[PDB]
Subunit: 250 residues, 4 copies
C-alpha cells in the first residue's frame, strides 16, 4: 500500500527512541523525511539505520519545554526543507505525580507532557496549512483508564485527546487532519524484574505480550498518510485489547 | 428518594451562580451543607434563598488560581464544620484561547480551568477519605466534541475527564467515589437569533439544558444512592454529544 | 429528592427477581405503580412487601418471547390504569452461545434477550408518548467488553445499547426519554445459585469480586435500581440516549489495578 | 507500506459493489486474493478490473440469509484455495424498520444484517485460526448515533460492534484479530440509486454532505477500504476489538460546526 509520503517532511518529537524512534524509522522506510526533535542526540546506530532508509533525515537538539527552542527549531526545519508536512507530538514521561504532590509538581508535569504538544502545534500549524499536512498526537491508555499515582501525566494525556478533537475541528477547512494513537504497554529499552515484566505482560489480552514500538508506528504513519484521508479527530487504540476487553479475561 | 446527604458538608467551587449555584441550591434543598467557594460575593437573593433551605450554608471569597487561598479556604471549612463530605469542582470559563494564541495564553487558560480542579482535590482528599465522601468534576461537551477556537478550555475540560478516571482509581480503597458531569448548552449568567440558532441544535426539545438539570445529576452522584458509581462521565446534554448530527 | 413518580405506571420485565425486583420495589417506594411482567409467579414475600408499599402494583404472567402475550399484557395494563408512564426492559439471560454454536442457537439467544426489548418498546411507546414517559433498557458490560463464549447475549446486549440511541432520536419530539443502565457484577439469589454449582463457591465468589475496582465487591440490585429509577424520573429530564455504567469501575478503570 | 497480504485469501461479503467492491479491489491491488460472496453476478467491468490485478480472485453466488449457502460457499473456498486468511463482513441494507413495524419486520431486518455476520464468522473462524487470520466487520455510525426510523438496522449494526469485542476476546489465544470499521456517509452508486428518488436529488445530496465536518463531502468507498484492509494486515498486529470510525468527523465532532 503506497502511503504517498515520499519526500514529506515530518517533525517527530522525542523521535529518536522508543515509540518516537519507531515512528521516525517507519517514515524513513516510506521515504518520508523525519526530522527528530529531541533533548539528546540520537545514538549512532539509530542514525545509521535512519539515514540508510532516508539520507536526508535529520535531528535537531530541542528542549521542548523551552517555547523559544520549539519556535526556532520549527523555523530551522523550514529553512532547511522549505516545507512541513506532518507533526508527530510524542515526547513525554510518566512522572508519577499523584494527588499528594501539590500544585508545583502538577504543573511541572503539564510542562513535561501537555504544554509542548500545544506549543509545537502552535508553531507548526501555519506550515501544515500550506501543505494540507497532518498531525498525530501520541497519548496513553492512562488518559482513559487512570493508573493511580499520576494525576499530572494522566491530565496531560487526556488533554492531548481533547486537543485532538479540538484541532480536528479548528483545521477542518484547511484539510489538516489531526488524530491520536493510544498505546498501553510498549516495550522499550527504557521500560525481581523477571517477575514484574511477566506480571504486566500477562495483563495484555492479545498474546499476553507488550505491544512493540513498530506496531504503534505503523498506525501512526498510516494516520499521517492520505490513506486516512477522511479520518480526523479520531483516537486509535493500539493496545492488544488492554483498554476495551473484559478485565476478567486471562 | 432520600439521598442521605443531610448535614453532609460539600464544597462547590464557582458555587454561587449558573450551574454551581444550582448545585449549591439543590444541596441545600436536600439538607446538605453547601460551602460556596467563589471569586465574588453571591447576590443577596441567592444567599437568602440558600439560607432558607440551609441556614448553615456558607460562602467563602476565594480566587481559585491562588493555591494558598484554596488551601486556607479548605482549612477554614474543616475548622468550621469538622468534616468534608464532598467536593464539586465547577468553576471555569471558556476563554477562547485558540491555536494562534501562544504559550502564555494557553497556560493562563489551564490556570483558569484545569489547575484548580487538581489543587482543590489535593487539599480536600485527606478529609474526604475520613468521611468516605465524593468528588464531582463538572466538565464540558467540548472536551470530547471540540469547538474550534478554544484549545485552552478544551485541553482543561478533557484533562478533567481524565483526572476523574485517575482519582477514581487512586481513591478506590478509601471508598471515595469520583465522577464527572458533562453539560453541553446551559443558560447561565454571562451566556445571556443567536439564541435560537444554538437552541435548535439540542436534540431533546430544541432547548437549553437548565442549571437545575445539571445539578440534579451532580447531587445524585455525590450521594450514596450512587454508591457503586465511580470514574464515570455522565452526559446531561439533551442528546447533544451522542445523537445523530443530522437530526432536526 | 422528589422524583415525581407518584402514581406513575411503569412496566418492569422480569420485575420480580434480582435487578428487576429491586427496580419494582424502588418504584413502589417512590409511590410509583410497578407492573411486573414475568414468566414465573413472584415470591409471596415479594408480593406482600410490594403491596405493603404500593397496593395498586400488579403482576401479570408473561412469556416475553411470545409476541401476542406481550401485546395482550400491555393491553391489560392500559385497561387497568388507562395510562403508561414507563417501561423497564430488564429480562434476560447470559446463555453462553458461542461462535461455534451456529445459527439456530444464536437466533434463539436473540429471542431470549434482544427481540422482546424491541417487542415491549413497540407495544409500550404509543402509550408513553401521551404521558411523556420514559424507557430504561438494562444491558450488560459484556456489550462493550466481550466475555468469550456468549455471542448471542453479547450481540443482544449491544443491540440494546444501539436501540437506546435509536429510540432516543425517534422519540425526542414526544418528550419520551430512553436510557440504558450497564451493570457488571450484581449479586442476585440466581447468580448466588449458579456460583453454588462450583466446587468452591466461596472461592468462586471471591475470585469474581476481586476484579471489581471499587471495594472488590459485587454491585447490589438496589444500586442498579437507584440509577434506573432516577433515569425514569423527570429529575433526568435532559438525559436521553445515554448509557449509564453502574459497575464499581469494572468497564473503564485500569485492568492492571488490584 | 508492505501489508504482507500477498496470496492471502479473503472473503468479502457484498464484495462486488460500493464499499465491499472497493475492499475487494484494494485487496487485489495488494496481491491478496479476494473472494466475493454476493447475491448478484458482479459487473463484467468489475470482474475484468479485479482479474487484471489478481487473476485468482473469485466470485461465488451466495444468498447470505441462507445458512447452508454460507456453509457451502466457505467450503468451496477452502476446496479451491486450501486456506482462509480473512473475512470481511460487509453486506447489509438500511431497511427503515421503525418502532412501529413490529416483530416480523424487526426480525427480518436482523436476518438481512446481523445474523449473516454471525453465520459467516461461524463458518470462517475454524479456518482463520490455522492462518492466524483476521476479521473486519463493517458497521455504521447509526449503531452509536441512532437515526430515527431504523430499529432493525440500528440494532443489527450495534450488535456487530458488540460482536467485534466478543470475538476479539474469544479468539485472542489463536492470534485472530477482529475489528470493525464505522462509516457514516459513503457515496455508492446504490446510495445514488436511492437519492435518485427525490424531487431535487442534488439538493438532497447537498443537505447530507453539508453535515460532514471534513470537507462537507461524502467519504469514498476507497477511504473505507483502505482502513479495512489495513486492519486485515499484520501492520495492525496488536489491534483487536477496535471500532475505527472513518467518517470525516461525523460521529465525534461538535454538531454545531458548519
Ligand atoms: N511506553 C509505553 O508503554 C507507553 C504507553 C502509553 C503511552 N506512551 C506514550 O508514547 C509516547 C512515547 O514514549 P516512549 O515510551 O517511547 O518514550 P521514551 O522515553 O522511550 O522516548 C521519549 C523520548 O522523548 C524525549 N523527550 C522526552 N521529553 C522531552 C522534552 N521535554 N524535550 C525533548 N525531548 C524529550 C526523551 O528523551 C526520549 O527520547 C509518549 O507520549 C508516551 O506517553 C507510551
Ligand atoms: N453554561 C454552559 O453551557 C456549559 C457548557 C459546558 C460546560 N459547562 C461547565 O459548567 C461549569 C460552570 O460554568 P457556568 O456556565 O455555570 O459558568 P457560570 O459563570 O455563569 O459561573 C461560574 C462561576 O465560577 C466562578 N469562577 C470562575 N472562575 C473562578 C476562579 N478562577 N476563582 C474563583 N471563582 C471563579 C465565577 O465567578 C462564577 O461565579 C464550568 O465548569 C463549565 O465548563 C457549562
Ligand atoms: N446479575 C448481573 O451480574 C448482571 C450483569 C449484567 C447485566 N445484567 C442484566 O440485568 C438484567 C436482569 O438480570 P438479573 O441478573 O436480575 O437476572 P435474574 O435472572 O435474577 O432475573 C431475571 C428475571 O427475568 C425473568 N425472565 C427472564 N426471561 C424471561 C422471559 N422470556 N419472559 C418472562 N420473564 C423472564 C426471569 O424469570 C427472572 O425473573 C438482565 O438484562 C441482565 O442481562 C445482570
Ligand atoms: N453507504 C454508506 O453510506 C454506509 C454507511 C454506513 C455503513 N455502511 C455499511 O457498509 C456496508 C456496505 O454498504 P454499501 O453501501 O457498500 O452497500 P451496497 O448496497 O452498495 O452493496 C451491498 C452489497 O451487498 C450485497 N448484499 C446485500 N445483502 C446481501 C445478501 N443478503 N446476500 C448476498 N449479498 C448481499 C448487495 O447486493 C450489494 O452487492 C454495509 O454493512 C453498510 O451497513 C454504509
Ligand atoms: Cl519495534
Ligand atoms: Cl435551573
Ligand atoms: Cl439490593
Ligand atoms: Cl472510491
Amino acid at each position: 500500500m503506497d502511503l504517498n509520503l515520499q519526500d514529506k517532511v515530518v517533525i517527530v518529537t522525542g523521535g529518536a527512541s522508543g515509540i518516537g524512534g519507531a515512528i521516525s524509522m517507519r517514515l524513513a522506510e516510506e521515504r518520508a523525511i523525519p526530522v527528530v526533535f529531541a533533548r539528546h542526540a540520537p545514538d549512532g546506530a539509530f542514525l545509521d539505520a535512519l539515514a540508510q532508509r532516508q539520507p536526508r533525515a535529520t535531528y535537531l537538539p530541542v528542549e521542548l519545554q523551552d517555547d523559544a527552542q520549539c519556535r526556532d527549531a520549527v523555523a530551522q526545519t523550514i529553512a532547511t526543507f522549505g516545507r512541513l508536512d506532518g507533526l508527530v507530538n510524542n515526547a513525554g514521561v510518566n512522572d508519577g505525580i499523584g494527588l499528594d504532590a501539590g500544585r508545583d509538581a502538577f504543573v511541572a508535569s503539564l510542562e513535561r507532557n501537555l504544554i509542548h504538544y500545544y506549543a509545537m502545534a502552535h508553531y507548526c500549524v501555519p506550515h501544515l496549512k500550506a501543505t494540507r499536512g497532518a498531525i498525530v498526537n501520541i497519548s496513553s491508555k492512562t488518559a482513559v483508564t487512570g493508573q493511580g499515582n499520576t494525576s499530572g501525566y494522566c491530565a496531560s494525556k487526556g488533554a492531548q485527546l481533547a486537543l485532538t478533537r479540538e484541532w480536528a475541528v479548528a483545521l477542518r477547512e484547511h484539510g489538516v487532519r489531526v488524530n491520536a494513537v493510544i498505546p498501553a504497554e510498549v516495550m522499550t529499552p527504557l521500560y525481581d524484574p523477571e517477575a514484574k515484566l511477566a506480571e504486566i505482560a500477562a495483563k495484555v489480552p492479545l498474546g499476553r505480550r507488550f505491544t512493540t514500538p513498530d506496531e504503534i508506528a505503523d498506525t501512526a504513519v498510516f494516520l499521517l498518510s492520505p490513506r486516512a484521508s477522511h479520518t480526523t479527530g479520531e483516537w486509535l487504540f493500539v493496545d492488544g485489547g488492554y483498554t476495551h476487553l473484559d478485565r476478567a479475561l486471562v
